[PDB]
Amino acid sequence: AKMAFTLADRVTEEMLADKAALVVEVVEENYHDAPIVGIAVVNEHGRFFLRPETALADPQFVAWLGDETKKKSMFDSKRAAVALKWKGIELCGVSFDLLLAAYLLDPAQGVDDVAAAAKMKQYEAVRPDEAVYGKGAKRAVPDEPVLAEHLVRKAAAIWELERPFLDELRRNEQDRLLVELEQPLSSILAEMEFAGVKVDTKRLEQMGKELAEQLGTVEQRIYELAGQEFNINSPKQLGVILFEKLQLPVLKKTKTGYSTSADVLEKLAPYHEIVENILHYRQLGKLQSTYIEGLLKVVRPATKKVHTIFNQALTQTGRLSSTEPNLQNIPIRLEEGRKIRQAFVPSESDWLIFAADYSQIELRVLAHIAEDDNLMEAFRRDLDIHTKTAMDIFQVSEDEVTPNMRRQAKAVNFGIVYGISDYGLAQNLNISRKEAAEFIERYFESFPGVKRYMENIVQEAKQKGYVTTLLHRRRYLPDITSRNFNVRSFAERMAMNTPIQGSAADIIKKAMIDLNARLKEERLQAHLLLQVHDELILEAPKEEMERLCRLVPEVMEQAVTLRVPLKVDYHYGSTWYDAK
DNA sequence: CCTGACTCC
DNA sequence: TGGGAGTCAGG
């Protein structure tokens, strides 16, 4: 805890070495158009703190930032890159990101500051961010000497930790996953976030006006059926109305009282019509609160764009998540909500939205990893996999599969991937549990490779302590041998599912890197706007659609070679809604 | 603040 | 007694 550094007034030459640890500090959680509060550089020649007002205005330092041959090691480089884009400055030459390194080594650690990564190698010459800045309403940037020491200690930690982290990744055969996948993807996500998605606010506002009217009508209908006014958005008050006033059967309880979940309310429809009304109301209410009001609150008014942040180092399976706003959960399943997508429009005139999605990628990945003959053959023939499972389960010819049979079979196919039990399947389908049990039993008799995979992967997790994905992502499962049934079972289901969900994440990430390269190689104006787990959304001039129609699906299908084909569907139109 | 509701994959 | 997420209002 005796670290010397130069609190510099101007930029000098020794600060611009061809290798440095760099800290560009953005304290606001949402880094879009957020202030840069300080800069630190550590390199061969010493340790330096710079004021942004000075440094970001100095052409030598800006030139260095954007010089791809001057290599930088950082933590959360995407944060810095985007904050710099808002200042009109390009960051290049990031060769090591400690956030992403820590994430690959163990996603469960929840590393989101340098001190937490430093903890993984018993390095303690740096403080947690929360300790320096404070929390909540107490959050503030400290006096310059305090800030400066903190930023320098973060840069110094990155400097000393790079090698130890690379050495462990290399031992895990994850070094290429960092350097050739996650780090390049970080730059692509930075582009997507900064570009943002344009919103038709006039349309959204009109939809909200109509929604408020409809909400009011449904609300009063509910109070009439209930015989009383109450807060419909209060599961507690609702529970009193349903299970005490109206005396409907209690199908499920939670730790706090009666359950009013959608699952339960659906099953109460034979008892009282009010439950269908309430379900409708809570749907409409979430549209209004989240996809109208919440969305309008984050639109930048001068440009009418929304700028999400894709968290690349959060999920336990290798997926991205999307926040403020979340653009990975925009409604699509009910037509009423799906219309929200009409408000998502191209950023330029005479441009269109192009959306491409993988068809059943998790089931194709399962087929591959399990090497199940019958499942692989189905995908090779492009037989409808839900129709196929229905024939095996119900033991009928293909022409005898009723749309209901297929419905149930779809539920089985998707449920197997999550380790669903017969209880869960029976409740999902609202069918006999004896029957649900036989469906699961027949499924595994029909796809014995899948059954072997499920057994083998749990045994592997118990023996190694972790499971792995196609591109070598890991997830540790220290609870897999717990003596407690609930704890152990949850970990076994994680063991089953994580290689599937995580490999699918690996594939779409590689596809984004390959797609970006191809777009840039052909000088297309098309660019990525969003990723939604198994879907990619782009915008482009209308002239480029013919090209994207061939290029995007091809790049996506060819991202990795499995034992079965990957299949991609695609559409385009004048709004996200119309790209269907 | 957590809990349970809604939304997506 | 179904894997992975985020946001919201109510309490």
UniProtKB/TrEMBL annotation:
Residues the entry annotates as binding Mn(2+) 1: 357-358, 534
DNA-directed DNA polymerase family A palm domain mapped to chain residues = 337-544
Provide the binding site for Mg(2+) 4: 534
Binding-site residues for Mg(2+) 3, renumbered to this chain: 358, 534
> Where, in this chain's numbering, is Mn(2+) 2 bound?
357, 534
UniProt: CTP 1 binding residues: 173, 175-177
Task: Provide the protein name.
Answer: DNA polymerase I
Range of the intact protein held here = 299 to 878 of 878
